[PDB]
Amino acid sequence: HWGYGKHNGPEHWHKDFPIAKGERQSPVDIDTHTAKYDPSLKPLSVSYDQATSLRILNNGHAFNVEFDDSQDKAVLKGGPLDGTYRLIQFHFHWGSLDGQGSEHTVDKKKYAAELHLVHWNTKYGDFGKAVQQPDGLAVLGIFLKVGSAKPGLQKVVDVLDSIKTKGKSADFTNFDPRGLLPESLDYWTYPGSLTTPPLLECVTWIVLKEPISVSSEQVLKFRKLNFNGEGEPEELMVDNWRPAQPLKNRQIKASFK
Ligand SMILES: CCCCCNS(=O)(=O)c1cc(S(N)(=O)=O)ccc1C(=O)O
Numbered sequence: 001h002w003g004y005g006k007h008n009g010p011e012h013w014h015k016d017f018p019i020a021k022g023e024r025q026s027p028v029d030i031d032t033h034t035a036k037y038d039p040s041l042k043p044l045s046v047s048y049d050q051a052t053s054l055r056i057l058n059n060g061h062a063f064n065v066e067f068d069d070s071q072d073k074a075v076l077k078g079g080p081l082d083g084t085y086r087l088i089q090f091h092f093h094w095g096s097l098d099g100q101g102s103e104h105t106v107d108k109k110k111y112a113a114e115l116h117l118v119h120w121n122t123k124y125g126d127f128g129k130a131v132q133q134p135d136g137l138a139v140l141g142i143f144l145k146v147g148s149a150k151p152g153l154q155k156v157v158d159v160l161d162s163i164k165t166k167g168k169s170a171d172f173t174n175f176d177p178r179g180l181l182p183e184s185l186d187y188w189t190y191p192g193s194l195t196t197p198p199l200l201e202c203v204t205w206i207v208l209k210e211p212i213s214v215s216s217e218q219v220l221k222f223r224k225l226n227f228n229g230e231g232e233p234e235e236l237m238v239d240n241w242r243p244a245q246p247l248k249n250r251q252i253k254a255s256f257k
Protein backbone atom coordinates (compact mmCIF):
# COMPACT_ATOMS: atom_id res chain seq x y z
CA HIS A 1 0.00 0.00 0.00
CA TRP A 2 1.02 3.68 -0.21
CA GLY A 3 3.65 5.22 2.06
CA TYR A 4 6.84 7.28 2.03
CA GLY A 5 9.53 4.67 1.18
CA LYS A 6 11.53 4.21 -2.05
CA HIS A 7 9.00 1.76 -3.46
CA ASN A 8 5.63 3.24 -2.38
CA GLY A 9 6.38 6.96 -1.94
CA PRO A 10 4.89 10.18 -3.39
CA GLU A 11 6.26 9.47 -6.92
CA HIS A 12 4.18 6.26 -6.98
CA TRP A 13 0.85 7.57 -5.66
CA HIS A 14 -0.55 8.53 -9.06
CA LYS A 15 -0.95 4.85 -10.07
CA ASP A 16 -3.66 4.26 -7.43
CA PHE A 17 -4.77 7.92 -7.18
CA PRO A 18 -4.59 9.60 -10.64
CA ILE A 19 -5.71 12.94 -9.11
CA ALA A 20 -2.08 13.09 -7.86
CA LYS A 21 -1.35 14.83 -11.20
CA GLY A 22 -4.41 17.11 -10.95
CA GLU A 23 -5.00 20.82 -11.23
CA ARG A 24 -5.06 21.77 -7.53
CA GLN A 25 -2.63 19.52 -5.67
CA SER A 26 -0.88 20.27 -2.39
CA PRO A 27 1.56 21.07 -0.99
CA VAL A 28 3.15 23.91 -2.98
CA ASP A 29 6.09 26.24 -2.74
CA ILE A 30 5.01 29.66 -1.50
CA ASP A 31 6.91 32.29 -3.50
CA THR A 32 6.74 35.22 -1.06
CA HIS A 33 7.58 37.81 -3.69
CA THR A 34 4.73 36.60 -5.99
CA ALA A 35 2.02 36.10 -3.34
CA LYS A 36 -0.24 39.14 -3.52
CA TYR A 37 -1.66 40.96 -0.56
CA ASP A 38 -5.45 40.70 -0.76
CA PRO A 39 -6.95 43.56 1.31
CA SER A 40 -10.41 41.93 1.03
CA LEU A 41 -9.23 38.92 3.11
CA LYS A 42 -10.33 38.93 6.76
CA PRO A 43 -8.50 38.12 9.98
CA LEU A 44 -8.73 34.43 10.76
CA SER A 45 -11.11 33.49 13.56
CA VAL A 46 -9.69 30.55 15.51
CA SER A 47 -12.14 29.65 18.32
CA TYR A 48 -10.60 26.73 20.22
CA ASP A 49 -11.65 27.58 23.83
CA GLN A 50 -14.22 24.73 23.83
CA ALA A 51 -12.05 22.16 22.00
CA THR A 52 -12.47 18.58 23.26
CA SER A 53 -9.52 16.31 22.40
CA LEU A 54 -10.27 12.60 22.76
CA ARG A 55 -7.56 10.35 21.49
CA ILE A 56 -4.20 10.08 19.78
CA LEU A 57 -3.68 7.46 17.05
CA ASN A 58 -0.62 6.17 15.16
CA ASN A 59 -2.17 5.49 11.73
CA GLY A 60 1.01 4.25 10.05
CA HIS A 61 1.71 7.58 8.27
CA ALA A 62 1.55 10.11 11.12
CA PHE A 63 -0.15 10.47 14.46
CA ASN A 64 -3.55 12.11 14.73
CA VAL A 65 -4.82 13.98 17.76
CA GLU A 66 -8.58 13.53 17.37
CA PHE A 67 -11.34 15.87 18.57
CA ASP A 68 -15.02 15.56 19.35
CA ASP A 69 -16.58 17.18 16.25
CA SER A 70 -20.21 16.08 17.00
CA GLN A 71 -21.05 19.74 17.86
CA ASP A 72 -19.57 23.19 17.03
CA LYS A 73 -16.91 23.26 19.77
CA ALA A 74 -13.62 24.20 18.08
CA VAL A 75 -14.11 26.14 14.84
CA LEU A 76 -12.27 28.03 12.17
CA LYS A 77 -14.03 30.92 10.42
CA GLY A 78 -13.15 34.13 8.63
CA GLY A 79 -10.02 34.63 6.59
CA PRO A 80 -10.79 33.33 3.06
CA LEU A 81 -13.62 31.08 4.32
CA ASP A 82 -17.39 31.26 4.06
CA GLY A 83 -19.18 29.62 6.93
CA THR A 84 -18.02 27.45 9.78
CA TYR A 85 -15.38 24.76 9.77
CA ARG A 86 -15.16 22.29 12.62
CA LEU A 87 -11.82 20.93 13.97
CA ILE A 88 -11.60 17.12 13.59
CA GLN A 89 -7.89 16.35 14.03
CA PHE A 90 -4.36 17.64 13.92
CA HIS A 91 -1.18 15.88 12.91
CA PHE A 92 2.35 16.66 11.78
CA HIS A 93 4.77 15.98 8.96
CA TRP A 94 8.48 15.87 9.77
CA GLY A 95 11.91 14.91 8.59
CA SER A 96 14.78 12.64 9.40
CA LEU A 97 16.88 15.77 10.03
CA ASP A 98 16.05 19.41 10.83
CA GLY A 99 16.66 20.58 7.24
CA GLN A 100 13.55 18.94 5.87
CA GLY A 101 10.11 17.77 6.95
CA SER A 102 7.61 20.47 5.94
CA GLU A 103 5.21 19.94 3.06
CA HIS A 104 4.76 23.56 2.10
CA THR A 105 7.96 25.44 1.45
CA VAL A 106 8.62 29.18 1.63
CA ASP A 107 10.87 30.41 -1.20
CA LYS A 108 12.03 26.78 -1.41
CA LYS A 109 12.95 26.72 2.33
CA LYS A 110 11.94 23.45 4.01
CA TYR A 111 11.09 23.66 7.70
CA ALA A 112 11.81 20.85 10.18
CA ALA A 113 8.11 20.01 10.43
CA GLU A 114 4.61 21.22 9.63
CA LEU A 115 1.48 21.04 11.79
CA HIS A 116 -1.90 20.57 10.06
CA LEU A 117 -5.14 21.37 11.88
CA VAL A 118 -7.90 19.82 9.78
CA HIS A 119 -11.41 21.32 9.79
CA TRP A 120 -14.58 20.39 7.83
CA ASN A 121 -17.36 22.63 6.49
CA THR A 122 -20.44 22.06 8.66
CA LYS A 123 -22.80 22.95 5.65
CA TYR A 124 -22.07 19.35 4.43
CA GLY A 125 -23.22 17.71 7.68
CA ASP A 126 -20.38 15.20 8.10
CA PHE A 127 -16.68 14.87 7.32
CA GLY A 128 -17.11 12.09 4.72
CA LYS A 129 -19.48 14.35 2.74
CA ALA A 130 -17.29 17.39 3.11
CA VAL A 131 -14.20 15.73 1.51
CA GLN A 132 -16.31 15.27 -1.64
CA GLN A 133 -16.71 19.07 -2.06
CA PRO A 134 -14.29 21.71 -3.41
CA ASP A 135 -14.79 23.84 -0.27
CA GLY A 136 -15.17 20.87 2.09
CA LEU A 137 -12.05 21.26 4.26
CA ALA A 138 -9.96 24.05 5.67
CA VAL A 139 -6.49 23.07 6.83
CA LEU A 140 -4.48 25.43 9.00
CA GLY A 141 -0.77 24.82 8.34
CA ILE A 142 1.91 25.94 10.83
CA PHE A 143 5.65 25.54 10.29
CA LEU A 144 7.97 24.21 13.00
CA LYS A 145 11.57 25.29 13.36
CA VAL A 146 14.03 23.88 15.91
CA GLY A 147 15.16 26.19 18.71
CA SER A 148 13.40 26.83 21.99
CA ALA A 149 10.98 24.21 23.28
CA LYS A 150 7.23 24.68 22.75
CA PRO A 151 5.71 24.10 26.21
CA GLY A 152 2.26 23.45 24.69
CA LEU A 153 3.67 20.59 22.59
CA GLN A 154 5.23 18.53 25.42
CA LYS A 155 2.01 16.70 26.42
CA VAL A 156 1.93 15.35 22.81
CA VAL A 157 5.64 14.46 22.88
CA ASP A 158 5.29 12.58 26.13
CA VAL A 159 2.43 10.28 25.00
CA LEU A 160 4.29 9.12 21.85
CA ASP A 161 6.04 6.17 23.58
CA SER A 162 2.57 4.64 24.13
CA ILE A 163 1.66 4.77 20.38
CA LYS A 164 4.96 3.68 18.90
CA THR A 165 3.54 1.49 16.14
CA LYS A 166 0.77 1.58 13.54
CA GLY A 167 -2.71 0.96 14.97
CA LYS A 168 -1.85 1.94 18.54
CA SER A 169 -3.94 4.61 20.18
CA ALA A 170 -4.15 6.25 23.58
CA ASP A 171 -6.62 8.35 25.48
CA PHE A 172 -5.73 12.04 24.99
CA THR A 173 -8.28 14.26 26.60
CA ASN A 174 -8.18 17.91 27.62
CA PHE A 175 -5.36 18.85 25.25
CA ASP A 176 -5.54 22.54 24.31
CA PRO A 177 -4.48 23.22 20.70
CA ARG A 178 -4.20 26.98 21.34
CA GLY A 179 -0.81 26.04 22.85
CA LEU A 180 0.49 25.21 19.36
CA LEU A 181 -0.25 28.56 17.69
CA PRO A 182 2.28 31.26 16.94
CA GLU A 183 1.71 34.92 18.01
CA SER A 184 0.65 36.21 14.60
CA LEU A 185 -2.19 34.85 12.47
CA ASP A 186 -0.84 36.42 9.25
CA TYR A 187 -1.29 33.77 6.56
CA TRP A 188 -1.09 32.75 2.94
CA THR A 189 -4.04 30.99 1.32
CA TYR A 190 -4.72 28.99 -1.85
CA PRO A 191 -7.07 26.22 -3.09
CA GLY A 192 -5.58 22.77 -2.88
CA SER A 193 -5.83 19.15 -1.81
CA LEU A 194 -5.18 16.54 0.83
CA THR A 195 -1.43 15.85 0.87
CA THR A 196 -1.96 12.11 1.42
CA PRO A 197 -3.97 9.61 -0.60
CA PRO A 198 -6.72 9.90 -1.60
CA LEU A 199 -5.41 13.39 -2.56
CA LEU A 200 -8.89 14.86 -2.85
CA GLU A 201 -9.12 18.40 -4.16
CA CYS A 202 -11.31 19.60 -1.28
CA VAL A 203 -9.03 21.88 0.77
CA THR A 204 -8.77 25.60 1.38
CA TRP A 205 -5.21 25.91 2.64
CA ILE A 206 -4.38 28.55 5.22
CA VAL A 207 -0.61 28.56 5.95
CA LEU A 208 0.61 30.81 8.76
CA LYS A 209 3.66 32.97 8.10
CA GLU A 210 5.15 32.77 11.61
CA PRO A 211 6.67 29.38 12.52
CA ILE A 212 6.54 28.00 16.03
CA SER A 213 9.78 26.98 17.70
CA VAL A 214 10.15 23.45 19.12
CA SER A 215 13.23 21.88 20.75
CA SER A 216 15.60 19.42 19.19
CA GLU A 217 14.55 16.93 21.91
CA GLN A 218 10.88 17.41 21.04
CA VAL A 219 11.30 16.63 17.31
CA LEU A 220 13.75 13.76 18.09
CA LYS A 221 10.89 12.01 19.90
CA PHE A 222 8.64 12.32 16.77
CA ARG A 223 11.46 10.52 14.94
CA LYS A 224 11.29 7.51 17.34
CA LEU A 225 7.82 6.62 16.12
CA ASN A 226 7.34 3.70 13.72
CA PHE A 227 5.52 3.39 10.39
CA ASN A 228 5.33 -0.39 11.00
CA GLY A 229 2.99 -2.35 13.24
CA GLU A 230 4.01 -4.01 16.51
CA GLY A 231 6.58 -6.77 16.04
CA GLU A 232 7.27 -5.91 12.36
CA PRO A 233 10.67 -4.78 11.10
CA GLU A 234 11.29 -1.32 12.57
CA GLU A 235 10.92 1.49 9.99
CA LEU A 236 11.32 4.86 11.72
CA MET A 237 8.43 7.28 11.01
CA VAL A 238 10.50 10.04 9.40
CA ASP A 239 10.18 12.01 6.15
CA ASN A 240 6.41 11.57 6.02
CA TRP A 241 6.03 14.66 3.79
CA ARG A 242 4.88 15.04 0.21
CA PRO A 243 7.11 17.37 -1.83
CA ALA A 244 5.83 20.58 -3.46
CA GLN A 245 3.51 20.11 -6.44
CA PRO A 246 3.01 22.28 -9.55
CA LEU A 247 1.10 25.48 -8.82
CA LYS A 248 -0.61 25.40 -12.23
CA ASN A 249 -3.42 27.93 -12.60
CA ARG A 250 -3.48 29.15 -8.98
CA GLN A 251 -2.68 32.33 -7.09
CA ILE A 252 -1.46 32.36 -3.50
CA LYS A 253 -2.94 35.30 -1.58
CA ALA A 254 -1.40 36.98 1.50
CA SER A 255 -3.43 38.36 4.39
CA PHE A 256 -0.71 40.90 5.23
CA LYS A 257 1.20 43.75 3.50
C1 LIG B 1 -12.16 9.67 4.01
C2 LIG B 1 -11.00 10.11 3.14
C3 LIG B 1 -10.36 11.44 3.55
C4 LIG B 1 -9.04 11.22 4.24
C5 LIG B 1 -8.43 12.53 4.75
N1 LIG B 1 -8.43 12.59 6.22
S1 LIG B 1 -7.85 13.88 6.99
O1 LIG B 1 -8.27 13.56 8.32
O2 LIG B 1 -8.55 14.92 6.35
C6 LIG B 1 -6.26 13.97 6.69
C7 LIG B 1 -5.72 15.15 6.14
C8 LIG B 1 -4.35 15.24 5.83
S2 LIG B 1 -3.77 16.67 5.20
N2 LIG B 1 -2.18 16.68 5.19
O3 LIG B 1 -4.28 17.80 5.94
O4 LIG B 1 -4.10 16.72 3.81
C9 LIG B 1 -3.51 14.13 6.11
C10 LIG B 1 -4.01 12.94 6.64
C11 LIG B 1 -5.37 12.81 6.92
C12 LIG B 1 -5.84 11.55 7.54
O5 LIG B 1 -6.62 10.73 6.89
O6 LIG B 1 -5.53 11.34 8.68
Ligand SMILES: [Zn+2]
Binds near residue numbers: 116195
Ligand atom coordinates in the same frame (compact mmCIF):
# COMPACT_ATOMS: atom_id res chain seq x y z
ZN1 LIG C 1 -1.05 16.87 6.76
